[PDB]
Design a protein around this motif. Structure first.
Motif, PDB file in Angstrom:
ATOM      1  N   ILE B  39       0.894  -1.049   0.051  1.00  0.00           N
ATOM      2  CA  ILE B  39       0.026   0.030   0.039  1.00  0.00           C
ATOM      3  C   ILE B  39       0.927   1.197  -0.068  1.00  0.00           C
ATOM      4  O   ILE B  39       1.495   1.385   1.026  1.00  0.00           O
ATOM      5  CB  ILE B  39      -1.055  -0.041   1.387  1.00  0.00           C
ATOM      6  CG1 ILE B  39      -1.740  -1.265   1.209  1.00  0.00           C
ATOM      7  CG2 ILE B  39      -1.701   1.266   1.314  1.00  0.00           C
ATOM      8  CD1 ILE B  39      -2.601  -1.698  -0.031  1.00  0.00           C
ATOM      9  N   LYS B  40       1.013   1.814  -1.181  1.00  0.00           N
ATOM     10  CA  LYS B  40       1.749   3.070  -1.289  1.00  0.00           C
ATOM     11  C   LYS B  40       1.246   4.331  -0.418  1.00  0.00           C
ATOM     12  O   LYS B  40      -0.145   4.185  -0.456  1.00  0.00           O
ATOM     13  CB  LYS B  40       1.743   3.596  -2.953  1.00  0.00           C
ATOM     14  CG  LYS B  40       2.415   2.335  -3.814  1.00  0.00           C
ATOM     15  CD  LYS B  40       3.917   2.117  -3.600  1.00  0.00           C
ATOM     16  CE  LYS B  40       4.567   1.417  -4.690  1.00  0.00           C
ATOM     17  NZ  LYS B  40       4.255   0.157  -4.767  1.00  0.00           N
ATOM     18  N   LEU B  45       2.042   8.016  -4.437  1.00  0.00           N
ATOM     19  CA  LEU B  45       1.178   7.925  -5.551  1.00  0.00           C
ATOM     20  C   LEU B  45       0.917   9.308  -6.392  1.00  0.00           C
ATOM     21  O   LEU B  45       0.679   9.033  -7.590  1.00  0.00           O
ATOM     22  CB  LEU B  45      -0.281   7.628  -4.894  1.00  0.00           C
ATOM     23  CG  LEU B  45      -0.568   6.209  -4.459  1.00  0.00           C
ATOM     24  CD1 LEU B  45      -1.910   6.093  -3.432  1.00  0.00           C
ATOM     25  CD2 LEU B  45      -0.592   5.202  -5.579  1.00  0.00           C
ATOM     26  N   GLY B 158      -8.228   7.212  -6.853  1.00  0.00           N
ATOM     27  CA  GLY B 158      -8.757   6.224  -6.104  1.00  0.00           C
ATOM     28  C   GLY B 158      -8.032   5.460  -5.071  1.00  0.00           C
ATOM     29  O   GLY B 158      -8.473   5.580  -3.796  1.00  0.00           O
ATOM     30  N   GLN B 159      -6.763   4.911  -5.261  1.00  0.00           N
ATOM     31  CA  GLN B 159      -6.055   4.409  -4.184  1.00  0.00           C
ATOM     32  C   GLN B 159      -5.471   5.278  -3.241  1.00  0.00           C
ATOM     33  O   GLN B 159      -5.480   4.943  -1.994  1.00  0.00           O
ATOM     34  CB  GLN B 159      -4.768   3.775  -4.938  1.00  0.00           C
ATOM     35  CG  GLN B 159      -5.169   2.568  -5.738  1.00  0.00           C
ATOM     36  CD  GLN B 159      -4.109   1.954  -6.641  1.00  0.00           C
ATOM     37  OE1 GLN B 159      -3.034   2.537  -6.743  1.00  0.00           O
ATOM     38  NE2 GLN B 159      -4.143   0.726  -7.132  1.00  0.00           N
ATOM     39  N   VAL B 161      -7.132   7.841  -1.977  1.00  0.00           N
ATOM     40  CA  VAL B 161      -8.349   7.991  -0.936  1.00  0.00           C
ATOM     41  C   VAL B 161      -8.221   6.821   0.078  1.00  0.00           C
ATOM     42  O   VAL B 161      -8.493   7.245   1.266  1.00  0.00           O
ATOM     43  CB  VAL B 161      -9.752   7.868  -1.802  1.00  0.00           C
ATOM     44  CG1 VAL B 161     -10.744   7.786  -0.675  1.00  0.00           C
ATOM     45  CG2 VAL B 161      -9.918   8.865  -2.783  1.00  0.00           C
ATOM     46  N   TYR B 162      -8.154   5.586  -0.238  1.00  0.00           N
ATOM     47  CA  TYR B 162      -7.894   4.416   0.527  1.00  0.00           C
ATOM     48  C   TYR B 162      -6.482   4.430   1.298  1.00  0.00           C
ATOM     49  O   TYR B 162      -6.794   4.284   2.825  1.00  0.00           O
ATOM     50  CB  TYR B 162      -7.822   3.127  -0.274  1.00  0.00           C
ATOM     51  CG  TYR B 162      -9.569   2.521  -0.255  1.00  0.00           C
ATOM     52  CD1 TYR B 162     -10.617   3.128  -0.449  1.00  0.00           C
ATOM     53  CD2 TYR B 162      -9.614   1.261  -0.699  1.00  0.00           C
ATOM     54  CE1 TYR B 162     -11.583   3.009  -0.553  1.00  0.00           C
ATOM     55  CE2 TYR B 162     -10.787   0.624  -0.862  1.00  0.00           C
ATOM     56  CZ  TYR B 162     -11.783   1.327  -0.821  1.00  0.00           C
ATOM     57  OH  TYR B 162     -13.130   1.163  -0.955  1.00  0.00           O
ATOM     58  N   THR B 163      -5.366   5.000   0.829  1.00  0.00           N
ATOM     59  CA  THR B 163      -4.291   5.000   1.716  1.00  0.00           C
ATOM     60  C   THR B 163      -4.565   6.063   2.804  1.00  0.00           C
ATOM     61  O   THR B 163      -4.511   5.846   4.088  1.00  0.00           O
ATOM     62  CB  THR B 163      -3.140   5.688   0.911  1.00  0.00           C
ATOM     63  OG1 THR B 163      -2.690   4.519   0.082  1.00  0.00           O
ATOM     64  CG2 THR B 163      -1.993   6.072   1.815  1.00  0.00           C
ATOM     65  N   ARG B 165      -7.731   6.918   4.230  1.00  0.00           N
ATOM     66  CA  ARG B 165      -8.391   6.301   5.137  1.00  0.00           C
ATOM     67  C   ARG B 165      -7.666   5.290   6.074  1.00  0.00           C
ATOM     68  O   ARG B 165      -7.867   5.457   7.307  1.00  0.00           O
ATOM     69  CB  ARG B 165      -9.442   5.459   4.588  1.00  0.00           C
ATOM     70  CG  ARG B 165     -10.515   6.387   3.726  1.00  0.00           C
ATOM     71  CD  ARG B 165     -11.517   5.756   2.898  1.00  0.00           C
ATOM     72  NE  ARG B 165     -12.402   6.584   2.390  1.00  0.00           N
ATOM     73  CZ  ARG B 165     -13.451   6.149   1.738  1.00  0.00           C
ATOM     74  NH1 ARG B 165     -13.949   5.031   1.507  1.00  0.00           N
ATOM     75  NH2 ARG B 165     -14.463   7.040   0.955  1.00  0.00           N
ATOM     76  N   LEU B 166      -6.761   4.621   5.743  1.00  0.00           N
ATOM     77  CA  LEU B 166      -5.914   3.803   6.494  1.00  0.00           C
ATOM     78  C   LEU B 166      -4.964   4.741   7.213  1.00  0.00           C
ATOM     79  O   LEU B 166      -4.575   4.347   8.545  1.00  0.00           O
ATOM     80  CB  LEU B 166      -5.102   2.806   5.214  1.00  0.00           C
ATOM     81  CG  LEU B 166      -5.640   1.783   4.618  1.00  0.00           C
ATOM     82  CD1 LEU B 166      -4.969   1.299   3.738  1.00  0.00           C
ATOM     83  CD2 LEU B 166      -6.360   0.746   5.774  1.00  0.00           C
TER      84      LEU B 166
END
Lengths: 170, 170
Positions: B39-40, B45, B158-159, B161-163, B165-166
């Motif tokens: 997970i970058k 990103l 999109g990725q 956003v996920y990083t 959140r994490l």
């Protein structure tokens, strides 16, 4: 000679391909797994992408969505109500988007991509400037909605890769 | 009347906007944080998206990339070598893509998006069928490379956003 929507159509194909390559690495139990409150399962992401293409393109096309018209709602049998308006899922509602077999996700996404590509191939360039919702600043046009639909699908396909990595470690 | 690349251009703008909205919620330390081996970080990103638009569009344009030509490499001062060919980062190499201030990421991405949009606005429709790499089946054309570049940017947004959140829980 080329349609103004052709490149958007080829971009949607990359989203479609990415979701399928990700799903192919998972069991259905893995696909159904949501790794955290704010990290959606691959099943949720693929269903949501198919659902949003379906709903948005069907609304531009003044047609009933395939979810209903092709009876995908009965195949999915979600413990979620079908309601007039779509809403933002709570984490607990999102965990209820699960499927019995992976093929269903592939089939509904393929149907929604087909619908989208059909619309894109038939929209006339003069129609792209049409205002579809005046109650925003600036108004929402057909073009804005189409770009939003392609953006949503592609961006969710990226998120699916990340959820896969979190769920299966690769 | 409309360019065949206009919708792709508006789609890239959504990627650009998403990266900026995500970065605005983070400190630079948070942006630099990679939550897992695969997970970058948001910094990786955004740098990677700017870097890939830059390199690919500059290669189609037969120009030196901005990374070098505008000296972004000196501003970033990465503990990574600049080499003839780009390569797939190891997790340990990816952790070295960090910045001193968030503004640098915004500035280099804005420059790479501008370059991309300029190319898109000037490419002639007849040029899109040109084969740029014959050593694939089927050959890679200008069009395929352009679609790949837009797909990459949007999907990475999109990725991010996920990083986020994490890393920051929201």
């Amino acid at each position: 000679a080329m349609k103004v929507t052709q490149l958007s159509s080829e971009t949607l194909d990359r989203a479609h391909e990415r979701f399928e390559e990700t799903l192919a690495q998972m069991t259905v139990a893995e696909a159904n797994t949501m790794p955290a409150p704010l990290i959606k399962s691959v099943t949720w992401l693929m269903w949501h992408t198919a659902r949003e293409l379906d709903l948005q393109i069907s609304a531009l096309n003044h047609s009933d969505p395939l979810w209903l018209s092709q009876h995908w709602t009965e195949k999915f049998a979600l413990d979620l109500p079908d309601e007039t308006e779509d809403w933002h899922h709570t984490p607990e509602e999102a965990a209820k988007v699960v499927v019995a077999e992976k093929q269903l996700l592939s089939d509904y996404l393929a149907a929604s991509v087909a619908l989208t590509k059909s619309y894109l191939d038939q929209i006339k360039e003069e129609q792209l400037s049409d205002v579809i919702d005046k109650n925003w600043t600036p108004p929402v046009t057909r073009q804005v909605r189409l770009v939003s639909a392609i953006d949503d699908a592609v961006m969710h396909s990226g998120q699916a890769v990340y959820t896969r990595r979190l769920v299966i470690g690769k």
